[PDB]
Amino acid sequence: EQISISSPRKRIYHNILETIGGTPLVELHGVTEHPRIKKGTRILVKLEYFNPMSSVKDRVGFNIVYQAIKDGRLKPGMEIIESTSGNTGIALCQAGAVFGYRVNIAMPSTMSVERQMIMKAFGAELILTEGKKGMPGAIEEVNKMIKENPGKYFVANQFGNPDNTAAHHYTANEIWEDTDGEVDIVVSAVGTSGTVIGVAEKLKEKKKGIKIIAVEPEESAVLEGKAKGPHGIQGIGAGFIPDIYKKEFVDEIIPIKTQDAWKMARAVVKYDGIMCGMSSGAAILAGLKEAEKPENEGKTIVIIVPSCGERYLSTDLYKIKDEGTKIQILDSLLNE
Amino acid sequence: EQISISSPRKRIYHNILETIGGTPLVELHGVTEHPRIKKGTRILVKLEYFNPMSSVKDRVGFNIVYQAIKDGRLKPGMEIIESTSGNTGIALCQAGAVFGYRVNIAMPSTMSVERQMIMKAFGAELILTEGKKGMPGAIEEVNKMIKENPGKYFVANQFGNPDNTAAHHYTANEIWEDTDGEVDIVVSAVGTSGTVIGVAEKLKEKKKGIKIIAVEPEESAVLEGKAKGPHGIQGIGAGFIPDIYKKEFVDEIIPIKTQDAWKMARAVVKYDGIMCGMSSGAAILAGLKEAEKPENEGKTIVIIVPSCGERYLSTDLYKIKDEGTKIQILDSLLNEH
C-alpha cells in the first residue's frame, strides 16, 4: 500500500546504447482478477518498451551491429542495410547513429510512414520500393543493391542472424535474477523468434523444465504447421519459420486470434495502466490462459511485452470499443 | 570502447507506478564536438522519457494523486480532473488507472488528438472544448464543472500544486547520486517549473555553488519579465509565471528560439542517436552554450530531457531538413554573440 518509485541507477551511461536492457518486470493485478486464477499464481510482464527506442528490437539492432564491428563483418567505409518496416529498422538506425555507420532501410513506400520519419530523423537513407510489391519487393531491391556493390554492405539479416538470438541471453539473465530463480513459465509472441529461443537457451541452461511458450496469430499459425495467412498482430506472424528458430527449445505454441490480441491489449491498459502493443495483447492472453490451468497454481509466469501502444495510434487497436464489466471482458477472452 | 548494456534491475515492481523515476543520466558526445567546448567538461542528459509513459510528467501525475490520497484530498467517490493537453493528462490517466479513480481531462477538441487517443485508452473521460476557445476554454469548462459539482472533483492544478515541485526532490537525488556529487550546473526548460525548482531546492541543500539555469522560449520570455508571445516549443513557455516558480532558486534564465530548439533536437538524434523532444532541444542548446564558457571548463553539466521525439511526429520538428555537415550544424547553433 506504500508505493516506492525507482531509486537512482548510480551509473552514468557513456552513450544511449548502454541504457539498452535491464527492463522492468511488473506484476499484473487488474487483468488477473479471476476466481480461477489462484492468488499464489504470479503473472509478471517484462516491459521491453523501457528500451531507449521503446521496443525489444533495441537489443537486436545493437547486438547485430556491435558484434559485426567487433567481428570485422562491418568495417569503415561499409554501410548497414536491412529490409524491414518495423522496430528492427529503428533499432539499426539508433545503433548506426551511435557507431557512426550509414544505415539503409528498405521497405514498401506503402508502409509505416511515421516509422519512415523516425528512421530519417536518425539519418537513415530509406529505400522505398513498390507498394504492391510488399516486403518481397524490398528484399529484392536490397539484393540488387548488394550485387551491384559488392563489399559495400553489411546485411543485418534479422531472421537468420544468431546475434539476434544471442542478445536475448541478457533478456534471460534479467528474468532469472529479477525472479530470484522462481520463474516457471515464459511466454513470448514470435516474430523473428530471437526472444523466445534466446531466452529459452539461456534459461534452460539455468533450470531445465522451465516451460517455454511461443505465441503466434491463429490466422497465420506457421509454427504449428499451418499456412501463412492474413492477420492483424503487428510485429509477429512473419509467415515462415525463421532460420534462427530452434523448435527443440519451445515446449508449447499457443495461437491467438488477432481480435482477441487487440481486446486483451485494451483491457491491460484499462485495468493495469500498462500501455502495451498488439503482440503483447497476444502474449498476455496466452499467459492468462496458462495462469487458469490447475497444474499451474502458484507458479510464476513471465510474459514478454515487446512494444508500447503509442506506436499503434494510427491502427485499429483502440478504435473498437468493448462492452461489459471487467469480469465480462475477461470471461469473454478466456472462454471459447 | 567496450560497450556494456544495463544490468538486471533485481526488483519485481508491484505495479507500473513503481517503475517511475530513477531515469538514466547519459553523456553527450556527438553534439559536443565543437572547438569552443573543452575536452574536460562533461555534458550529460537525464532522459525522463524512460518513465513508463515516456515523459517527466509521470512523476508529477503520480505524486499529485498519491499525496492527495495520503492527505485525504482524494477519497473514494471523487474523480480527478485537469485541464491540460500535454503529458500531464497522460500521467494523471496512468496514476488514476492504477489507483482506481476516474480521470477527466479537458482540452480543445482540436488539440493533440494523438494524446486524446492515448487518454481514452486509459479509460479517461475526455472533455472536449471549443477549438477557437483554446486552453482558456478548457479551463473555463473545468471551472464550470467544479462549480456545479462541489466536492466531486479533485483538481490536479499542475501549475500551483506543491506536490509537483516535491516530486523533483527525487529527480534531484538521482542527479546527486548518479554524479557522485560532482554535478555543477543543471539546465531545465520550464513548463510548470516543478522540475527546475524541485531540483534546485534539494540540490542547493547538498552543496554550495550548483548553478541552476531555467530555459524558456525567446518569443515568450515571461520569466525574464518579457511579454507572452506565440512560440513552437511544445511543453514549455506557458505564457505566465507559474505559482510554484521560485525565482530565488534560479541563477540564470536562457531564452532559446523555437527554430533553434528544433534544429538542436534534430542534431541530437542524428549525432548522438538520442531522440529527444522539442523542449529538450531547447535545454540541450542552452547547456551547450554553458559548456562553451571558459568559466565552465571541466564542470559537470546536467540537462533535463523531458520527452521523446516520437510524440512529435505530426509537428514540423523533423520535416525541416538541415543541409550541411555536423560541424556546420553545431557551429550554426552556437553562432550568436
From TrEMBL, chain B:
Residues 17-306 form the Tryptophan synthase beta chain-like PALP domain. Its cofactor is pyridoxal 5'-phosphate. The modification N6-(pyridoxal phosphate)lysine is found at residue 57. Pyridoxal 5'-phosphate binds at residues 87, 191-195, 279. InterPro entries: Cys_synth, Cys_Synth/Cystath_Beta-Synth, CysK, TrpB-like_PALP, TrpB-like_PALP_sf. Keywords: Amino-acid biosynthesis, Cysteine biosynthesis, Pyridoxal phosphate, Transferase. GO terms for molecular function: cysteine synthase activity. GO terms for biological process: cysteine biosynthetic process from serine. The modification N6-(pyridoxal phosphate)lysine (covalent) is found at residue 57. Pfam families: PALP. Belongs to the cysteine synthase/cystathionine beta-synthase family. This is Cysteine synthase. It comes from Entamoeba histolytica.
